[PDB]
């Protein structure tokens, strides 16, 4: 919807050379504000955004004790899951978990989710109604019946519908200059001679936030999907994103091709030409 | 804020 808050957890086991590595990151929209690394030196929930640093020590001490509990839950998960499939202790396995909430224009609850994966494939996930479970394989049905008898979905819904959207509103207000901003794309176009008859036009879009953007090529006002190349959105590194779309054009008729950039910071999409 | 310590599989 309008805004969202998401957490991402990853636990990869290192059989024979240490305990499993745990990495947790927090995101509000496309901005990372908290992180934790078991291999890091701080051994604490570390801030990654300026507006989250104003939280008191009760926050960080509580968050640090929560991520270590998340890692401790994944340690027994890695051992339990290898027994569900009769897998050896010599193989390195990965456990991933993510949850969060989506809010609307009124900053009220709109959508919630809580997903779990094992070795890169879906294991179990909470449905949209936040009341049922989607077990992937037969070994995942054991977790479902275990979590249904423990009323886990009822308590997860109290977070996704409750403190997730309430603390997302708190972060949006404290970081208004950062989270509620909208950076329009800085666009331009480059020309590259490919052959005697062909030439590629590259439509650039740099320094835009959030990452959602759409680049469309048109010829004489009609969409042209053939002979077009679109790369995935790149994080620039300074909190903004980059993306470009290209098209190969016969030499001389580059005036007929137009680039179109659709972004949140543009009420009407921009049109880019070569000349 | 984070959620409670999750249940194990």
């Amino acid at each position, epitope marked *: 919807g309008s805004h969202s808050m998401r957490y991402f957890f990853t636990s990869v086991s290192r059989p024979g050379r240490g305990e499993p590595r745990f990495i947790a990151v927090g995101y509000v929209d496309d901005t990372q504000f908290v992180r934790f690394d078991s291999d890091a030196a701080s051994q604490r929930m570390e801030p990654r955004a300026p507006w989250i640093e104003q939280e008191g020590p009760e926050y960080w001490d509580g968050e640090t004790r929560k991520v270590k*509990a998340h890692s401790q839950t994944h340690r027994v998960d890695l051992g339990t899951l290898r027994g569900y499939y009769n897998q050896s202790e010599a193989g390195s396995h990965t456990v991933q978990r993510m949850y969060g909430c989506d809010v609307g224009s009124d900053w009220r609850f709109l959508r919630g989710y809580h997903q779990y994966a094992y070795d890169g494939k879906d294991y179990i996930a909470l449905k949209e109604d936040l009341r049922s479970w989607t077990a992937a394989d037969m070994a995942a049905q054991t977790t479902k019946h275990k979590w249904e008898a423990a009323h886990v979905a009822e308590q997860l819904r109290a977070y996704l519908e409750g403190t997730c959207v309430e603390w997302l509103r708190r972060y949006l207000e404290n970081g208004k200059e950062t989270l509620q901003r909208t950076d329009a794309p800085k666009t331009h176009m480059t020309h590259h001679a490919v052959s005697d008859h062909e030439a590629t036009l590259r439509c650039w879009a740099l320094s835009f936030y959030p990452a959602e953007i759409t680049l469309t090529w048109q010829r004489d006002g009609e969409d042209q999907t053939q002979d077009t190349e679109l790369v995935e959105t790149r994080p620039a590194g300074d909190g903004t994103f980059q993306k470009w779309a290209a098209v190969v054009v016969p030499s001389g008729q580059e005036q007929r091709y137009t680039c179109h950039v659709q972004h949140e910071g543009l009420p009407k999409p921009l049109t880019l030409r070569w000349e | 804020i984070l959620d409670q310590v999750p249940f194990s599989v």
Partner: T-cell receptor
Amino acid sequence: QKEVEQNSGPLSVPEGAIASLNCTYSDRGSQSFFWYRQYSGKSPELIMSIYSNGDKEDGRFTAQLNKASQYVSLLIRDSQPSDSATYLCAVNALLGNQFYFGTGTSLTVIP
Amino acid sequence: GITQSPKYLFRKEGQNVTLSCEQNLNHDAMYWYRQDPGQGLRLIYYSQIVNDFQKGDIAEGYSVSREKKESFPLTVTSAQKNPTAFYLCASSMGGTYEQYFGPGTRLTVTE
């Protein structure tokens, strides 16, 4: 203030009537709310647990939760002599990963 | 699956007293409270993991060790000014989950 507040004064209710026990809390990332019953000289016994707004009926007592105005109540139908005890209000806190208790409210039904 | 020993204990002022609390629910968190007559619960010590413990609201004169996941021994020292209280032990799945109390220990220390 404390994190969980409730009127610790002795509350009396006629036998057979409805006993209403109120409890207020300070929002510290609170999402789970519980009611404990403790008799004179024994341990607190968990009797109720509510997680979403509204009413939750179980047996003769129902738990009422309202997160907007921070307060959670407990209504007891058909007040029996066995209900005479102090009821403790429990509220969790995702801020700090804590669990807070109230001072308790002594209930004594009158025949 | 939470037990405390002894149910009643009586010691002379000037030495240390060890209150035991064994837990069987495979909980990682365990708590120690004391309850004065007519009052509420007050946190003494608590532990999140098998080799960690943190001071509560009143930790003066109270020592606590956590060597294994199931045992949480509370040793009240002679530095405590008012050791006479109703000591309650509890455990929970996590820091934000509901706690289940043991039977309790009534400690009385006289001159």
